[PDB]
Design a protein around this ligand. Structure first.
Ligand SMILES: NC(=O)c1ccc(NC(=O)[C@@H]2CCCO2)cc1
Ligand SMILES: NC(=O)c1ccc(NC(=O)[C@@H]2CCCO2)cc1
Lengths: 412, 412
């Protein structure tokens, strides 16, 4: 019968820092992680900036021998996983290793490695493709490499649901624990799509902000002058643990994961419906799953991508789900500061939602200078808002009309 | 407690045929779908053959214009899914559409599309990249496009667990239904990795058979002269349905899905442990999940990739799990005929396991001319074996040491 699930460890790489506490201090100070991209020549691209991870040292985590074989998205997922496991204080043993699994996902996976090997294939031929090309590029290898290095023999898998990946990964990992398939899961996501194909591909769809001359102002969710999402890199991982397992070992518990929802829009490959009907179905599934009155929701970490249609669909969904309470809760997009970490978005945003509970503060939506038509909720414009938060909701919506919602609450 | 899950529809593209019945006729006849790859200069490659889908007409399913937006692996997953839904006779309505979801995965996803866009990017720069490059290439678009086409509003996600994808997709969809999150799921996998990067990538790892002179003899699971796996394309989809939901509408039920196991080896990035400890744990987990004794298993659809280490690991795992029953069950690798469909392997092999139950016949392991040291089980060498089959297992073992087992039983 269904067990309770708590958060005992968290780990992160983001455009604002190389761990959770540095990232969160940036979030609460309203600091932007967005800057011109330095790692390649973007002069022929319509977008030349994004949220890069700055000064990542893989030799904090892995031998340069192992690290050379792995795409950056895998390096980033392993860094966040290692941080989360250490933060949890969990000791892996012969007695518990079969009950500890991993579900670390990615939206796009090893696009840089595939680009570089494509360059070798076309310029020099197939014999120059890396022997490590496949295991170094495919999305399940965060889960694989983490399991090999820590000795995790529990459920081992990976989700890929585009921009919903991190939220779905955490939710489904919680279901694993809830239903008795594992006692512990490391779950979240990682992304590093800042290569020619990534910036070029999103560029070809005209989905990216082209505010090259003021990158820190590009990501402006619900602002009338928004002109698309900002592409960002990084990773979030959480250690999810059955409640009595966490209590038995004296774990520090950050918060409880009480609700998880999923829905499909069944509308369009890339565009969200204007009314947010799919997002609303998803949130309602999540709140019913958590046994909550919608009026209990104090904080929403929005998907809030800074796209014309996505930002307004989310207002419509929140008004539909919460009615008059939509005017009492606080809703913010941390993507205003971090940009859009795609498959990692839901994982870092789940961590920001847990810290909003820990610290009783709503992170700001920076750059919200002129809220658009109908964007009249408390969107925590400009500056962090200390307030009561018992229940926090984290939303993600992706290509293919795939929606996820996570519901967290304080644990006492 | 938990709801029962039955299979009411199946769909497939394979190297043996463009649907399930034609594929299955090939399987029972011991026919190979392996041939030198056409319309692609493979002179510089150490492997020049594979399992191609022959004569696929996407316009049976999509307009030319919508098909042009989608990588071949998505077209193949949509064909299998459309076939499965049609095979099920399910009528989607406003009363049930929220209860019908999709979990179609891929191991490698849109390599062909990525490859063809690298050409544009390197030669002509980013402005030639297709606007549909991202949504047309990402693994969750089979689930996405199927939900949009059929109006499915249930759980919408995609697994990517390398060669375990199709098995995990079906098992995790079955759980969704068992635990009441959906009444119907369309689940399985698709793969089209026969590009330079696929053939070159596996080739650079020396993972592939190089038996260019006799492609139909290359895939020879447990044969002493095997020299690695054969790369194959295609897709499988199953309609999973809650038992009372299937009975109420008068559905034709192929078989019941009674068990699902997962385990991580935590051993090596690409090689299974010699003793198959991980595959043994996973099968034991699946039998416990089904409430069945090892002695009740009659037929195993092996992973049986024709790699030296993989094939022997599976014999060790089966002897360990099944003890004095190991010789009474029949175990075969249909990869002897189909080659290795990677993330689709588990999907098409779940279909073969279901049809083994329907037709009371163990498919052959073709090319098993000289069983290797210790390969003394009933591996159904050369020809199909009619026999009693009440319980059938389908095993998948993939990169990252990720394992899955499905347990099917006759329904009456
Ligand atoms: N051996 C491990 O499992 C491992 C765990 C954690 C780390 N690093 C951190 O936790 C970071 C380093 C600075 C801030 O936090 C490195 C290795
Ligand atoms: N609005 C409410 O006060 C409320 C209370 C309880 C529930 N449901 C449950 O607690 C269980 C948990 C999974 C579904 O049923 C729903 C709503």
């Amino acid at each position: 019968s269904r067990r309770r699930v708590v958060i005992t460890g968290m780990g992160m790489l983001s455009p604002l820092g190389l761990d959770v506490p540095s990232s969160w201090e940036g979030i609460l100070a309203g600091r932007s992680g967005i800057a011109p991209i330095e790692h390649m020549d973007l002069s022929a691209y319509s977008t030349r900036f994004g949220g890069s991870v700055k000064g990542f040292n893989v030799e904090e985590y892995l031998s340069a021998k192992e690290a050379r074989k792995l795409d950056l998205f895998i390096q980033y997922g392993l860094a966040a996983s290692f941080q989360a496991v250490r933060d949890s204080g969990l000791e892996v043993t012969d007695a518990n290793r079969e009950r500890i699994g991993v579900s670390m996902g990615s939206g796009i996976g090893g696009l840089t490695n595939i680009e570089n090997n494509c360059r070798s294939l076309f310029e020099q031929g197939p014999r120059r493709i890396s022997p490590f090309f496949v295991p170094g590029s495919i999305i399940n290898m965060v889960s694989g490499f983490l399991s090999i290095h820590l000795g995790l023999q529990g459920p081992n898998y990976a989700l890929t649901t585009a921009q919903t990946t991190g939220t779905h990964s955490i939710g489904m990992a919680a279901r694993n624990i809830a239903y008795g398939e594992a006692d512990v899961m490391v779950a979240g996501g990682s992304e590093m799509a800042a290569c020619g194909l990534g910036l070029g591909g999103f560029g070809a769809a005209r989905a990216l902000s082209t505010r090259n001359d003021e990158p820190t102002r590009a990501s402006r969710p619900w602002d009338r002058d928004r002109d698309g999402f900002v592409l960002s890199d990084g990773s979030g991982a959480l250690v999810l643990e059955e409640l009595e397992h966490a209590r038995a070992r004296g774990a520090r518990i950050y918060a409880e994961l009480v609700g998880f929802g999923m829905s499909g829009d069944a509308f369009h490959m890339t565009a969200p419906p204007e009314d947010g009907a799919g997002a609303a179905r998803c949130m309602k599934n999540a709140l019913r799953d958590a046994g909550l009155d919608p009026r209990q929701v104090d904080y929403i970490n929005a998907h809030g991508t800074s796209t014309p249609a996505g930002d307004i669909a989310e207002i419509a969904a929140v008004k539909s789900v919460f009615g008059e309470h939509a005017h009492a809760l606080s809703m913010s997009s941390t993507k205003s500061m971090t940009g859009h970490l795609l498959g990692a978005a839901g994982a870092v945003e789940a961590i920001f939602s847990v810290l909003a509970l820990r610290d009783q503060v709503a992170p700001p939506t920076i750059n919200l200078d002129n809220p658009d038509e109908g964007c009249d909720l408390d969107l925590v414009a400009h500056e962090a808002k200390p307030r009561k938060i018992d229940v926090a909701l984290s939303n993600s919506f992706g290509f293919g009309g795939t929606n996820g919602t996570l519901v967290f609450r304080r644990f006492a």
